[PDB]
């Protein structure tokens, strides 16, 4: 980890709000959203994550 | 810049507003 990015660098990925497994590695332990530097992601994919995790929390797919 | 010149105009406007508040009634009913 800590590379350029997993989405902006690998060139293949998809940010899906239903991907609770993938969003668990990005949400904090308590349930909050981790910072952008710790994840090392471009601004676009960071906002995509943010909105996906927000949709998950809204549909009750995460502990908020 | 300095605050002296600003507070001077502030006090001037405050005194003007106080006079206007005091004289409001002298034109309130004379206006209506």
């Amino acid at each position: 980890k800590t590379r350029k990015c997993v989405f902006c660098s690998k060139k293949g990925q998809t940010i899906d709000y239903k991907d609770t497994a993938l969003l668990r590695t990005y949400i904090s332990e308590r349930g909050k959203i981790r910072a952008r530097r710790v994840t090392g992601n471009c601004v676009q994919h960071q906002r995509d994550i943010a909105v996906a995790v927000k949709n998950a929390r809204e549909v009750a797919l995460l502990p908020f | 810049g300095s605050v002296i010149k600003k507070r001077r105009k502030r006090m001037s406007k405050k005194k003007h507003r106080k006079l206007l508040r005091r004289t409001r009634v002298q034109r309130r009913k004379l206006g209506k």
Partner: protein
């Protein structure tokens, strides 16, 4: 967030104190109880400030600031030399020079003077000049190297400053908080705690703890560098 626990800190011996005749009345908050006449520092107040400083450096990295290193000891010259070149941060090893942060119009001249010499070294001019001119440069190197060790590559006027051993380097931390720039440092039971903007509980006479502290303070910049 969090990067370490108290288990790894207990092994470093960061709960020791000094004699009871060299303390200050305003350092009785971190103490819990007197046992055999030695002072102890709480542990719950360590991880909080550690994470606070970590996030502050994480933010200042993106803002355009980094952390520095300062010191005046002449026994741990190796601990502050190996980890420095890894990230490329400033540091002082032998001689704590005067006027490096508060004065910026003077160090830039010596930086260019040293750059000129390091660039001309590639030519190898030894015969064109007299023996005295070459012999002087040998002692000049020993005179100029014991004061500046990492101030050559900063060139960025960072927005975060870290100080260590405030008891002896009070002038450093004293001038750090001058311009209001965020200041961080570790405090002792015989110094002033209000001088640092973000204190970090930690002993000043523990190399095992100082190494880990410097490592975790320098890794914050690499965290943002590898991402940028």
């Amino acid at each position: 967030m969090a990067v370490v626990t108290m288990k790894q800190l207990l092994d470093s011996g960061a709960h020791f104190g000094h004699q009871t005749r060299r303390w200050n009345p305003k350092m009785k908050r971190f103490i819990f109880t007197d046992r055999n006449g030695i002072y102890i520092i709480d542990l719950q107040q360590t991880l909080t400030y550690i994470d606070k400083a970590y996030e502050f450096v994480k933010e200042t990295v993106a803002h355009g600031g980094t952390v520095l290193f300062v010191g005046t000891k002449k026994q741990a010259q190796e601990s502050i030399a190996e980890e420095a070149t890894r990230v490329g941060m400033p540091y002082v090893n032998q001689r704590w020079l005067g006027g490096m942060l508060t004065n910026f119009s003077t160090v830039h001249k010596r930086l260019q003077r040293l750059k000129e010499l390091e660039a001309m070294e590639q030519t190898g001019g030894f015969e064109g000049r007299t023996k005295k001119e070459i012999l002087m440069l040998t002692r000049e190197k020993n005179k100029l190297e014991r004061s500046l060790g990492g101030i050559r590559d900063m060139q960025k006027v960072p927005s975060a400053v870290w100080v260590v051993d405030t008891n002896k380097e009070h002038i450093a931390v004293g001038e750090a908080r001058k311009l209001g720039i965020p200041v961080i440092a570790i405090l002792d039971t015989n110094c002033d705690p209000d001088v640092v903007d973000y204190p970090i509980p930690g002993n000043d006479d523990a190399i095992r703890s100082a190494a880990l502290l410097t490592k975790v303070i320098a890794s914050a910049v690499a965290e943002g560098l590898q991402a940028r």
